[PDB]
Symmetry: C3
């Protein structure tokens, strides 16, 4: 009475059965292979906000390499960040950028965990480098946490952030 059907990502049109493919994730060249969508390298300014250990903000020059469903951030501060404590929480919210924002949004899978972030900066003429960690707290906002290299009030500069997300 009832025959045979196909559930997504399989679909049918005029009795032709197909694989629906996310071009950012895969594609066919006779077989199923990796993504066919253009990579892009976006460059923009992102104003990060201290949210604990600081109420200052900081301009970061960002390069985002969106390639397949991997997106890698390479960022640089301009100007200084005022820090109050010895650890600082620094927040990146998509609003504060100045564009398919899509491929700057982590998949729900990725958001489940804290992720590695490479951080360095200068504090009164000494360089500091730390293995730090980021966490998304909503799909549009993540926060990195790293030590500031001392106590009480100071101004760090030449802040670099290297990280990546699965979108």
């Amino acid at each position: 009475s009832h025959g045979l059907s196909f559930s997504p990502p399989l679909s049918v049109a005029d009795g032709v059965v197909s694989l629906d493919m996310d071009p950012y994730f895969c594609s066919q060249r006779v077989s199923l292979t990796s993504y066919s969508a253009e990579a892009q390298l976006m460059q923009f300014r992102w104003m990060a906000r201290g949210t604990n250990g600081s109420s200052d903000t900081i301009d970061m020059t960002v390069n985002a390499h969106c390639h397949g469903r991997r997106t890698d951030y390479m960022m640089s501060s301009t100007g200084n960040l005022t820090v109050t404590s010895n650890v600082v929480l620094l927040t990146f919210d998509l609003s504060d950028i100045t564009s398919d924002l899509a491929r700057l949004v982590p998949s729900a899978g990725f958001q489940a965990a804290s992720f590695p972030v490479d951080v360095s900066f200068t504090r009164d003429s000494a360089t500091h480098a730390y293995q730090a960690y980021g966490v998304y707290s909503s799909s549009r906002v993540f926060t990195i946490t790293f030590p500031t290299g001392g106590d009480g009030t100071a101004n760090i500069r030449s802040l670099t952030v290297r990280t990546g997300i699965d979108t």
Copy 2:
């Protein structure tokens, strides 16, 4: 007489044909896209064993970021490692850890080759950094090889290992 059938990863149930999907590798949102499984960041201690150029062992504080089927290791020694030669082979066996061990096991594809490992440590107050290489020698055990920065007996400290595996 004989009709039409479907081979894995295609399967059928009540005449509904499906793509069986590894959630750590892909998933559907109408189309075939990347993984839907939660990422996790595990933190644990791994005791590495010198196996040549040393018979000492060394506590490493490990963070493993298991995200999709990529797993990235960021590790730090505590205490010192006694080295005898000028290259050392350092072994990471899953037993020596203190948990889905699954996503700390490389795919058979990955094991076929030696893989890049970032290493640095301090030796009598000088820092040393090397591009080193790891090789799995069984699915549960890999060995990194790196130079020790001198000869005969010494103690290196602040050992860091940054690497990653395809699981």
Copy 3:
């Protein structure tokens, strides 16, 4: 009159319907999972050519870790590179290598953008490190651009290039 058919990467043979799979990209273990093809670590010499800011060339010792459809380059110069300007364009053409060249060729998706490249070198005894960028200009040729750390004629040495491509 006309029934039902299957378009690639779906195919059929003796009324058995299949997923055609790129083994460098995926495979089945009951479900669709990631690649099954061996990783390999190739080691060879690549002669890069200055193409602007220099007409010199430079031997690089290359290690390429081809794993799945990701290929990561770790390279080192031997000898010195003569630089004339304050930025230099350095070109890597597959001809100049001395082997499935296949997995050293970026997918068309990847070529669409400039990509991040890590570079450092020494210039009259000071170390220099820069976040640089590469661009393929044909599927067999890419060019990195980085600053040389000064002006007019000099010789840089101990040049390292760390980058990666989606193949």
